[PDB]
């Protein structure tokens, strides 16, 4: 009555490197060119920005380790900031940051995907919404099926994504090996320096949208067989060849476009795949594609499970943890969290959500690292794994303060709208999490429309 | 918890009436997806498709430049073929794509046996100082365009004599300097060559069978169309400036008239508008007029061709003792070392850098505008009626953003009074517009603004930015 493991290392190595390469350096190279010193400059930057993650990465290596529980950034931090910042944390993150996420996706999986049938004219928006609607639906049937073809999906697609970029710095490479200067010797024509506002600093916060993803594999802990050296070898294998693929392929498009084209471009990816390679150019723009389908899957296999966690705890309504008896898959959460992502399709525009995103998640894995050193300092004796020193983190957390500072100078007024979101589901915990004083008639109707969907859908509760 | 036990909800859950429940809530969930992508794909069958690029060259993306003298280019005593490679970032700056060169052959009179275009004349440089600067322009991404004219310092440009002689050293010429890696040429003052038709139809012929990158520029000084129209009866393909826009000006509708006419005349080709072959703009306008032409070359369909002074309103005539045929360039205070302080610090290329409210800003933005828009690279023109004494125009090329210019040739203020009925449904006006940028200071940018009660000032042009109706 409760689901197994049924995961290795080599599907969570999967996960992590598909959920990380999402459209990233496929639609976005241009930032850091134009935004900060010269091309060469931004060869730098991208790698600076990796390290960054990268130990970000490895405080997660140990924290994980030290409370094995699933649900990431949640069960973390319910422990050391008690009950409610755990369930405001829970609820925004359900209510805006998964469903944007998806929807995002999803979208340029679609867009990428009917490109070729509208090369130089834009696509009709109308196709687009129902194709990623479409993507997601057949995701979540997928999903509720049966976790095992799943884990070979996530598997192949992140195959194809290595193969698709490898693929690049094959054709970036080779377009240099026939010889030519490239524009390569001149380097900082005009890289001028960071301006009081901040230049050289303005493309980290740009740089660093790429490199996210690197906690989702924490989300699905507890479901991974002896997670306790697979989880730090998955990471340890994955951060360092996502970098060093990423500062090959920024190498890669440097090489082989001016800054004058890149500049008067929106999709780079497009313009090098058709500059190269001519006809049958729709390999690359398709495969792109296919990639955010994949990335699609992992974040599904990863929400659900988090709502799973919630319903343990009893902040979640007690539906939301159900699991058909013959079919481990959690069907209730997958069903709301499709329904969540379909409801949040009906937008006016795009990239109007993304803009406190990174607001929203770094505030929490600050809150989540400076939680950790406190219960430490709590609690000393523990059985975790290295024993590591707060020496690494202490200078992370004081970086992730500073992205806060960038986070209030673009559109303080919409982080101001934002925290009314948070400020009106506090309301949302007094009424049913704390206040367990109600009348006979709403728990008696709580539990026929429990059972109405148990009997719709057979599920049995877990233990 | 607060359900149903595992047990109970097993036993009771096999009646018939919830697996039959299921089962159709199953099929039509599955149903409806079918008809989603149905509904998908009859979307994406039923729109248009779209429009092909026409494969553009090197020269329709931007505008050309002249030099006509390149010792006066960075004043006296610096003339020389090498000079020319610090200054290229400047050129950089106003992002052209041409620098037509004068003529640095040996010539040093009528006379014809020892006049060669192969030697280029030891007072300019030499033969590696070309090479570098072909080198440096390729690393610029600037093409470079030599011209050629067997007199260049004479009376007549063609010896006055017969021309097979010298018809044959200019074709040996154009082969010889193609090896080198010019990226076209220029003749000037062919109205007073015999038999014109039938040269230059074998030059381009000849200059075509070399690449398909390559240019040839054909300047004369008539002003009749039938004359114009007359060089272009065997060739498509050549670039013609002469001076059809010049000798007028005074009435809106006159230029409209004429551009309109010339238009239709030849076909909707690739012309090249300018308003003379080897003057400045102030030689034939007044200096209240400058910017109102700056902006009516950019937005037409065709390939302007400017002369260097041009950007920032050089007068020949507003210093004395300056030949009008070669002013020198005003790059600072001490750039005219006779008679010194004369030249105040608005004249200065360095003292209009950073003034918004100045030619060369004006020239900057309109370069940036013309090379990066799909509609004013290869849009279509549509020319409507308006009130007398105003010229206006649309550009659209498939589905970008459409661009509408209203220019005010006369003295004084008046209404907009624009009408529609006279375009496809597709390049309908909208009410509202937004506006790019003015060439009178004292109005805003960036706020969409109504066009039915739309005045202008005396000499005033609008660039109004509309996006797909
Ligand atoms: C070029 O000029 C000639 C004059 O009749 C014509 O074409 C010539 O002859 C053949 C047929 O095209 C070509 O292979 C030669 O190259 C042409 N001779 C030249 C260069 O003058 C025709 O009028 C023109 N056609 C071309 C090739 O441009
Ligand atoms: C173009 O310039 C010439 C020279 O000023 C004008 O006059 C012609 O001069 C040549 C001698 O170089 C004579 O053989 C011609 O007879 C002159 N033309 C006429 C019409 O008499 C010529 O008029 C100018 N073109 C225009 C259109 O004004
Ligand atoms: C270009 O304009 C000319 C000149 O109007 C037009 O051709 C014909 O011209 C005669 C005399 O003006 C008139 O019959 C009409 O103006 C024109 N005939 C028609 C269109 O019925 C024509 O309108 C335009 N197109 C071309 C290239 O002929
Ligand atoms: C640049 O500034 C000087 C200083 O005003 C201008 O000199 C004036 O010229 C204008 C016409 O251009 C005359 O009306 C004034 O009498 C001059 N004033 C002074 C004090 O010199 C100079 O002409 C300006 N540049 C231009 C071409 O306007
Ligand atoms: N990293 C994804 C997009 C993305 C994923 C996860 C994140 O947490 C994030 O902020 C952004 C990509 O490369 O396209």
């Given at each position: 009555v409760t689901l197994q493991r049924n995961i290795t290392l080599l599907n969570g190595v999967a996960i992590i490197v598909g959920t990380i390469i999402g459209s990233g350096i496929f639609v976005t190279p241009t930032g850091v060119l134009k935004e900060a010193g010269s091309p060469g400059l931004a060869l730098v930057v991208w790698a600076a920005c990796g390290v960054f993650s990268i130990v970000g990465a490895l405080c997660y290596a140990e924290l994980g380790t030290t409370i094995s529980k699933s649900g990431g950034d949640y069960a973390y931090m319910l422990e050391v900031y008690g009950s409610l910042p755990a369930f405001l944390k829970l609820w925004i993150e359900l209510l805006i940051i998964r469903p944007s996420s998806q929807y995002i996706v999803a979208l340029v999986f679609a867009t990428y995907l009917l490109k070729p049938l509208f090369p130089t004219c834009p696509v009709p928006e109308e196709?687009?919404?129902?194709?990623?609607?479409?993507?997601?639906?057949?995701?979540?049937?997928?999903?509720?099926?049966?976790?095992?073809?799943?884990?070979?999906?996530?598997?192949?697609?992140?195959?194809?994504?290595?193969?698709?970029?490898?693929?690049?710095?094959?054709?970036?490479?080779?377009?240099?090996?026939?010889?030519?200067?490239?524009?390569?010797?001149?380097?900082?024509?005009?890289?001028?320096?960071?301006?009081?506002?901040?230049?050289?600093?303005?493309?980290?916060?740009?740089?660093?949208?790429?490199?996210?993803?690197?906690?989702?594999?924490?989300?699905?802990?507890?479901?991974?067989?002896?997670?306790?050296?697979?989880?730090?070898?998955?990471?340890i294998i994955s951060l360092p060849i996502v970098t060093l693929v990423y500062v090959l392929t920024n190498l890669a498009y440097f090489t082989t476009l001016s800054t004058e084209q890149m500049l008067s471009s929106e999709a780079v990816a497009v313009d090098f795949g058709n500059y190269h390679l001519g006809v049958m150019s729709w390999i690359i723009p398709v495969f792109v594609g296919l990639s955010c389908f994949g990335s699609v899957n992992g974040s599904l296999f990863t929400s659900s499970r988090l709502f799973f966690v919630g319903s343990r705890e009893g902040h979640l309504p007690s539906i939301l943890s159900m699991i058909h008896p013959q079919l481990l898959t959690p069907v209730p959460s997958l069903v709301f969290t499709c329904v969540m992502t379909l409801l949040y399709a009906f937008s006016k525009d795009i990239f109007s959500v993304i803009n406190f995103f990174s607001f929203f998640?770094?505030?929490?894995?600050?809150?989540?690292?400076?939680?950790?050193?406190?219960?430490?300092?709590?609690?000393?004796?523990?059985?975790?794994?290295?024993?590591?020193?707060?020496?690494?983190?202490?200078?992370?957390?004081?970086?992730?303060?500073?992205?806060?500072a960038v986070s209030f100078w673009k559109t303080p007024v919409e982080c101001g709208i934002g925290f009314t979101i948070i400020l009106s589901g506090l309301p949302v915990y007094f009424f049913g999490v704390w206040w367990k004083n109600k009348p006979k008639w709403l728990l008696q109707g709580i539990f026929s429309t429990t059972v109405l969907c148990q009997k719709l859908m057979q599920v049995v509760p877990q233990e | 918890f607060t359900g149903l036990s595992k047990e109970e909800l097993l036993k009771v859950a096999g009646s018939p009436g919830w697996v039959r429940t299921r089962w159709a809530l199953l099929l039509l969930f599955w149903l409806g997806w079918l008809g989603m992508l149905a509904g998908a794909v009859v979307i994406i069958v039923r729109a248009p498709r779209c429009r092909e690029l026409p494969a553009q060259k090197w020269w329709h993306t931007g505008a050309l430049y002249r030099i006509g003298d390149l010792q006066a280019f960075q004043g006296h005593g610096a003339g020389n073929l090498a000079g020319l490679k610090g200054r290229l970032d400047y050129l950089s700056s106003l992002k052209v794509k041409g620098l037509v060169l004068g003529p640095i052959h040996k010539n040093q009179k009528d006379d014809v046996a020892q006049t060669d275009l192969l030697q280029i004349d030891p007072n300019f440089g030499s033969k590696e100082d070309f090479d570098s600067l072909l080198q440096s322009a390729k690393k610029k991404s600037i093409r470079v365009i030599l011209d050629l004219t067997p007199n260049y310092r004479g009376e007549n440009s063609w010896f006055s004599t017969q021309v097979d002689t010298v018809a044959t050293k200019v074709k040996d010429a154009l082969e010889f300097w193609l090896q080198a890696g010019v990226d076209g040429f220029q003749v000037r003052d062919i109205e007073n060559l015999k038999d014109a038709s039938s040269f230059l139809a074998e030059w381009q012929n000849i200059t075509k069978g070399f690449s398909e990158d390559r240019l040839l520029i054909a300047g004369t000084n008539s002003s009749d169309l039938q004359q114009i129209l007359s060089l272009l009866e065997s060739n498509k393909d050549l670039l013609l400036t002469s001076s059809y826009l010049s000798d007028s000006g005074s009435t809106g509708e006159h230029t409209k008239s004429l551009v309109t006419q010339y238009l239709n005349a030849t076909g909707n080709r690739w012309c090249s508008w300018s308003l003379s072959q080897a003057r400045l703009l102030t030689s034939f306008l007044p200096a209240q007029l400058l910017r109102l032409y700056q902006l009516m070359l950019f937005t037409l369909p065709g390939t302007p061709v400017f002369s260097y002074g041009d950007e920032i309103g050089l007068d020949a005539a507003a210093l004395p003792g300056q030949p009008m045929e070669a002013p020198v360039m005003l790059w600072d205070e001490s750039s005219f070392p006779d008679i010194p302080g004369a030249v105040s610090a608005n004249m200065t290329v360095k003292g209009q850098s950073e003034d918004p409210g100045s030619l060369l800003s004006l020239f900057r933005r309109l370069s940036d505008q013309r090379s990066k828009e799909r509609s004013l690279l290869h849009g279509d023109f549509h020319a409507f009626s308006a009130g007398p004494g105003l010229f206006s125009y649309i550009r659209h090329w498939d589905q970008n953003e459409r661009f509408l210019v209203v220019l005010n040739f006369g003295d004084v203020g008046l209404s907009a009074g624009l009408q529609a009925s006279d375009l496809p449904a597709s390049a309908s006006l909208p009410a509202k517009a937004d506006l790019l940028l003015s060439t009178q200071p004292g109005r805003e940018e960036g706020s969409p603004l109504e066009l039915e009660r739309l005045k202008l000032e005396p000499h005033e042009g609008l660039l109004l930015r509309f996006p797909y109706a």
């Open positions: 196709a687009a919404k129902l194709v990623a609607c479409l993507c997601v639906l057949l995701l979540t049937a997928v999903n509720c099926y049966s976790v095992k073809a799943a884990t070979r999906v996530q598997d192949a697609f992140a195959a194809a994504k290595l193969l698709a970029l490898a693929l690049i710095i094959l054709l970036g490479f080779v377009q240099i090996g026939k010889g030519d200067v490239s524009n390569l010797d001149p380097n900082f024509s005009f890289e001028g320096t960071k301006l009081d506002v901040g230049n050289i600093v303005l493309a980290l916060y740009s740089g660093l949208f790429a490199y996210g993803g690197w906690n989702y594999l924490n989300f699905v802990t507890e479901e991974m067989i002896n997670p306790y050296r697979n989880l730090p070898l998955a990471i998640n770094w505030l929490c894995v600050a809150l989540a690292i400076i939680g950790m050193i406190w219960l430490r300092h709590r609690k000393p004796e523990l059985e975790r794994p290295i024993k590591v020193n707060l020496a690494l983190p202490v200078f992370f957390i004081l970086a992730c303060l500073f992205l806060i | -």
